[PDB]
Structure formats: C-alpha cells, structure tokens
Design a protein around this ligand. Structure first.
Ligand SMILES: *[C@@H]1O[C@H](CO)[C@@H](O[C@@H]2O[C@H](CO)[C@@H](O)[C@H](O)[C@H]2NC(C)=O)[C@H](O)[C@H]1NC(C)=O
Ligand SMILES: *[C@@H]1O[C@H](CO)[C@@H](O[C@@H]2O[C@H](CO)[C@@H](O)[C@H](O)[C@H]2NC(C)=O)[C@H](O)[C@H]1NC(C)=O
Ligand SMILES: *[C@@H]1O[C@H](CO)[C@@H](O)[C@H](O)[C@H]1NC(C)=O
Ligand SMILES: *[C@@H]1O[C@H](CO)[C@@H](O)[C@H](O)[C@H]1NC(C)=O
Ligand SMILES: *[C@@H]1O[C@H](CO)[C@@H](O)[C@H](O)[C@H]1NC(C)=O
Ligand SMILES: *[C@@H]1O[C@H](CO)[C@@H](O)[C@H](O)[C@H]1NC(C)=O
Ligand SMILES: *[C@@H]1O[C@H](CO)[C@@H](O)[C@H](O)[C@H]1NC(C)=O
Ligand SMILES: *[C@@H]1O[C@H](CO)[C@@H](O)[C@H](O)[C@H]1NC(C)=O
Ligand SMILES: *[C@@H]1O[C@H](CO)[C@@H](O)[C@H](O)[C@H]1NC(C)=O
Ligand SMILES: *[C@@H]1O[C@H](CO)[C@@H](O)[C@H](O)[C@H]1NC(C)=O
Lengths: 49, 219, 46, 164, 46
C-alpha cells in the first residue's frame, strides 16, 4: 500500500498515511410508536347487510 | 383599553432538546413590548397570522374559542369548548349565534344551532396563556398555566409555552371569537409576526430567557 | 448493435436513456450511459 | 335479481368493495403501519427512529428530556441523543469509530518489516501497544529512551534496532 | 493571578473556522435537501 500511494518501488524511512479505516454497521433497526386505531377495516368488509 | 406585554408569548418552536446553549430562530412570535388589546366582561376578531391569548380568573368564565372564516354554515369551522366536564374539540359546519355563550340548574350552551357534516370529533388567581397557529392544514396550539398572585391584571415575567395539540384539519381560518359563562344565579389578544429571536436554553433544556433582535440597537 | 423489434405506439418514449415504465422496467432497458440512435416508424400495414 | 340458493355460479350474489385512493392537494393523510424491529445497543448499526435516520452506536444515557421533546442535538447541530417511541427512554448516539492508518517503515533499503498505527482508535476494535496517538501493531515497547528517530506522536518515537 | 489575548485569539480563530466548516454540511446550495438519504429516497438515479 505504501508503494502504491507513493508511486515508487523504493520507500525511505518515515511514517506514511496510506488509507483510512472505519467500522461498518452490523445490522439495521427500526423504531416507531405503539399501535392505535389502525383503522377499523371490519365495518365495510364485515357488514350484515 | 390597551396594555403592554413585556416578554410574553415565547413557545418551543420544535421538538429538539438543547442543553446549555444560545440558539437562534426565525419564526412567528409576539414582539416584545407590544400593544395588546384589553377586553373586560365578546366580539368577532381577526386571525391573519396566529394569536397570543392570555386570561385571568379563579372561576372559569373563559370556556374556549371558536374559529373559522364565516362562523356559520356554507363553510367549515372549528369549535373548542369546555363545560364543567372537560374539553370538546369538534369540526363540523355550524350555525353560530351571533352572540354565542353558555349559561350557569346550571344549564347552558346557546352557542350554536347546527352540527352538520362533522369531519372531526373529540370528547373526554390563574394565568392561562395560549398560542394558536395554522400552517399547512395543521392547527397547532401551545399553552401554559402559570399561577398569578393577582386576580385579573397582566403581570410581568418570562414563561415559555409548551406544545399541546396538533390537528390535521385543512380548515381555512380568518376569524375567531370567545365563549363565556353568563351570570344567572379579562383577556388579551396579541398577534404574531415573523421575527428572529435568540433563546437561552437551560441545562435541563428549558427556555429561561430570550432576546428579540429587532427591538433596539443593543438587541 | 442493432436491436430490432416492435412495440405499442405509446411507449416509444420508453426507449430512452434513463426512465421508468412498464415496458422499460420489464422488457427492455438502456443504460443511462447510452450512446447511439433510436429509430421508430409505424407498422400496422405489415 | 331474484337470487335463489340453487343458482349456478355466475348467478349467485357477489359482494364488491371498490377502494379508491385519491390525492387532492392537502398536507398529508392516512398511510401504512410502519414496522418496528428490536433495539440493540453498543454496536454500529443503521438506526431509524420515526424518520430520524443515521448510523452509529447507541448507548443508554444520563440526560432528561422534556416530555414533549423527541431528540437532542448539540452545538454544530448534529443529533447526539434520541428518544425511542416505545420504551420512552433516551439514548446517546456515538459515531462508529474511524481514523487514519499510517505505516512505519525503517526504509525499504534496510528491511521489509513495517509497523502500523491506527490513529486515535482503541486497540480492541482492530505486539499490540496503546499510545495516545492511537493503537500501534508490530512494534515492541522497550523501556530505554533514545533520540527521536521516527515521530509517532504524544512523546513516542519508533526505530529499527537489534532486527526489529 | 488577577493578558494572554494573543494566545486566546489563535485558539478562537481555529475553532471559529472548524465550526463554520461543519455548519456548511447543512446547506442545499440549490438542491432539494441537504441529506443524501433524502435525494436517494425520492428521486430515481437519473
Ligand atoms: C371480519 O370479521 C371476521 C370475524 O372477526 C374475521 O374473520 C377472521 O379471519 C381470520 C383470518 O381468516 C380467522 O383466523 C378468524 O378465525 C376469523 N374470525 C373468526 C371469528 O373465526 C375477518 O377477517 C373480518 N374481515 C376482515 C376483512 O377483516
Ligand atoms: C406499548 O405496548 C407495550 C406492550 O409490550 C407496553 O409495554 C409495557 O410497558 C408498561 C409500562 O406502562 C410496563 O409496565 C410493562 O411491564 C410493559 N410490558 C411489556 C410486555 O413490555 C408499553 O408500555 C406501551 N407503550 C406505550 C406508549 O403505551
Ligand atoms: C396601541 O395602538 C393604539 C392605536 O391608536 C394607540 O392609540 C395606543 O396608544 C397604542 N398603545 C400603546 C401602548 O402604544
Ligand atoms: C359537555 O359538552 C359536550 C359537547 O357536546 C357533550 O357531549 C357532553 O355530554 C357535555 N357533558 C355532559 C355531562 O353532558
Ligand atoms: C354538507 O351538508 C349539506 C346539507 O346538510 C349537504 O347538502 C352536503 O351534501 C354535505 N356535504 C357532503 C360532502 O356530503
Ligand atoms: C383558503 O382560502 C383561499 C382564498 O384565497 C383559497 O384560495 C384556498 O384554496 C383556501 N384553502 C383551501 C385549503 O382550499
Ligand atoms: C433542573 O434544573 C435545575 C437548575 O437548573 C437543577 O438543579 C436540576 O437538577 C434540574 N433537574 C431536575 C429538577 O430534575
Ligand atoms: C541503499 O542501498 C544501496 C544498494 O545496496 C547502498 O549502496 C546504499 O548504501 C544504501 N543506503 C543506505 C544504507 O543508506
Ligand atoms: C480502551 O478500551 C478499554 C476496554 O474497555 C478501556 O478499558 C480503556 O479505557 C480504553 N482506552 C484506553 C486509552 O485504553
Ligand atoms: C518497563 O519498566 C517498568 C518499571 O516501572 C516495568 O513495570 C515494566 O514491566 C517494564 N517493561 C519492560 C518491557 O521491561
């Protein structure tokens, strides 16, 4: 990696920034308010007449 | 009569918590040191952009407001009421008495005479401030209840108003009124304009002070 | 590459670089990095 | 229709419901019931609370919102806390570790050995030596003090001795 | 114990610049939002 970022087959002594690093998200989560109402789809699909 | 607010009508303009900081906002506020009407005990007022509304008593003479454009049929309006039981929000097309009120036997409610086409229902001294605004079909209501150590005069001090309600109505509004409980056996009205304020947040996240940035050169 | 076929007269605007449509989303796609010409002429007489 | 129970299919009564979704020009209205997955802590995740979308690691906190307040943010206006809409508990948000990587070379004309520094990263998240400049792998920590040869930082330097 | 303004000013200038850098991550520059997860959610790739 040093040879790539320095564009050379020889490198001299030193300290060289070559890349970055970061941790990746393991999974995904979702949160939302409880349940309420949700509409009563039982009056039109559940009528007696 | 007319009176002077001092630093009144500050509400939390969003749900965001903030620790000890000074945050700057642009919104619709009641400017500091304003010219607020005085009413004793009432008439049809305008709305035009939000409303501040305080009131003072130990009994409960102020029993809600009524809103809308025509305050009658042929167009829709809101109605917010409170008998000795609890609040009753309602949205129909009404027929409102030109002088609507409720009595105090204790029989009452000569307010309207029509409740057609209802599109929303709901049922269930002192200083009681309210801020009413109406943006994008939502009718927002902020409020605060502070205890005065007077009976019925507008005091001085700072007290921020916390959001109460949110109604996705869609209703147009151009006018509003008030409702009072008669005798059978004091309130103010400010208006809101687009201002820029500087709010000081406590470490618990409450607004303790503010600066109106268009009052004077120091501000 | 000459791609030759026949379509309904409506979705002739469905043969274009970058789009959404029932013809473009299921039966034929062109990349947004397209480079070439599109020719269409009517046919119910054949 | 004179419906009768002994009718061939295609003459028996069918009940029909036609749902018609319309979109005038209001601000919003009815929508589906958003899902709700479990809530983990102490891992870099992709979270989503009500529409607040981001990624990071969630821990439990010592803040106290106001009952109407739904999330917190700091100076520079980044979200650094949140309330989750079912437990009513507030959670700290911390970005998921990141940094630079530097390689320490004694010169390719002398050796092919290298050491690696992971800048301001704790060593657990990557013999192994913890500096204040980060986590350093591939270098031995001696106890003597020489002149500085390659600067690591915060008072630490590295060098090719004897061979390592 | 009861003057180091030249040292305070270089600290203040650097902090004032670093804050202005971060506060620019929330401007549109003429776009629909400031969030890439909002342009990648209500717009097709083209
Ligand atoms: C109308 O109401 C009935 C009764 O509440 C619902 O019937 C249920 O359907 C589920 C799934 O098919 C079954 O597991 C239950 O056993 C049914 N109920 C009973 C009492 O047995 C029906 O789903 C409702 N219709 C709609 C459209 O919601
Ligand atoms: C949402 O519903 C859940 C049901 O799982 C509620 O969870 C309970 O919360 C109460 C607090 O009021 C606790 O006393 C119970 O021990 C909890 N039970 C379980 C199974 O978790 C939750 O309270 C509800 N949230 C809201 C907003 O009402
Ligand atoms: C409020 O405006 C009215 C308008 O005429 C004016 O008479 C009154 O003096 C004003 N009050 C104050 C406190 O400025
Ligand atoms: C209070 O007023 C509402 C307005 O409709 C009414 O529904 C309610 O019944 C009233 N309270 C009582 C005790 O009747
Ligand atoms: C509103 O009420 C009037 C009179 O009752 C009626 O003619 C009209 O149809 C109603 N509105 C709707 C949308 O039905
Ligand atoms: C409110 O009134 C205005 C009058 O200028 C009208 O144009 C507008 O459509 C009304 N609001 C709604 C939601 O229709
Ligand atoms: C609220 O703020 C006060 C003073 O700023 C502080 O003493 C207190 O600990 C905070 N939290 C409370 C009262 O829960
Ligand atoms: C680098 O390598 C060359 C070839 O082996 C050698 O001549 C030179 O001395 C080296 N440079 C050093 C040791 O600094
Ligand atoms: C690194 O992580 C360990 C493990 O929890 C912790 O004890 C330590 O305080 C962290 N920081 C340093 C500088 O070691
Ligand atoms: C370095 O010296 C300290 C003396 O306090 C000692 O505790 C430590 O073990 C030594 N480390 C090595 C690698 O010799």
């Amino acid at each position: 990696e040093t040879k790539c970022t320095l564009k050379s087959f020889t490198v001299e002594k030193g300290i060289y920034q070559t890349s970055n690093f970061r941790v990746q998200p393991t999974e995904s989560i979702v949160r939302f308010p409880n349940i309420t109402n949700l509409c009563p789809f039982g009056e039109v699909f559940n009528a007696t007449r | 009569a007319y009176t002077n607010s001092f630093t009144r009508g500050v509400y939390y303009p969003d749900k965001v918590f903030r620790s000890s900081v000074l945050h700057s906002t642009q919104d619709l506020f009641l400017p500091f040191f304003s010219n607020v009407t005085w009413f004793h005990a009432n008439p049809v007022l305008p709305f035009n952009d939000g409303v501040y509304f305080a009131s003072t008593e130990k009994s409960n003479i102020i029993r809600g407001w009524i809103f809308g454009t025509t305050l009658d049929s042929k167009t829709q309006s809101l109605l917010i009421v409170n008998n000795a039981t609890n609040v009753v929000i309602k949205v129909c097309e009404f027929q409102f008495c030109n002088d609507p009120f409720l009595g105090v036997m204790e029989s009452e409610f000569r307010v309207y005479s029509s409740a057609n086409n209802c599109t929303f229902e709901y049922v269930s001294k002192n200083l009681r401030e309210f801020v009413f605004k109406n943006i994008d079909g939502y009718f927002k209501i902020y409020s605060k209840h502070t205890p005065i150590n007077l009976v019925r005069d507008l005091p001085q001090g700072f007290s921020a108003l916390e959001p109460l309600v949110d109604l996705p109505i869609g209703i147009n509004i151009t006018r509003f009124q008030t409702l009072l409980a008669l005798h059978r056996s004091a309130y103010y009205v400010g208006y809101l304009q687009p201002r820029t304020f500087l709010l000081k947040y406590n470490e618990n996240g409450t607004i303790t002070d503010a600066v109106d940035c268009a009052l004077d050169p120091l501000s | 590459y000459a791609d030759s076929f026949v379509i309904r007269g409506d979705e002739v605007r469905q043969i274009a670089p970058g789009q959404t449509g029932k013809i473009a989303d299921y039966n034929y796609k062109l990349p947004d990095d397209f480079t070439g010409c599109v020719i269409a002429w009517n046919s119910n007489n054949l | 229709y004179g419906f009768q129970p002994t009718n061939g299919v295609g003459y028996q009564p069918y009940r029909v419901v036609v749902l018609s979704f319309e979109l005038l020009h209001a601000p919003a209205t009815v929508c589906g019931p958003k899902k709700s997955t479990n809530l983990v802590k102490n891992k870099c995740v992709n979270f989503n609370f009500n529409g607040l979308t981001g990624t990071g690691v969630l821990t439990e906190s010592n803040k106290k919102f106001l009952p109407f307040q739904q999330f917190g943010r700091d100076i520079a206006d980044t979200t650094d806390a949140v309330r989750d809409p079912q437990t009513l508990e507030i959670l700290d948000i911390t970005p998921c570790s990141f940094g630079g990587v530097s390689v320490i070379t004694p010169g390719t004309n002398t050796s092919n050995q290298v050491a690696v520094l992971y800048q301001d990263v704790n060593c657990t998240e990557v013999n192994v030596f913890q500096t204040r400049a980060g986590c350093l792998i591939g270098a031995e920590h001696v106890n003597n003090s020489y002149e500085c040869d390659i600067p690591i930082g915060a008072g630490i330097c590295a060098s090719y001795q004897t061979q390592s | 114990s009861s003057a180091l303004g030249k040292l305070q000013d270089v600290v203040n200038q650097n902090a004032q610049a670093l804050n202005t850098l971060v506060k620019q991550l929330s401007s549109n520059f003429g776009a629909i939002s400031s969030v890439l997860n909002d342009i990648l959610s209500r717009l097709d790739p083209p």
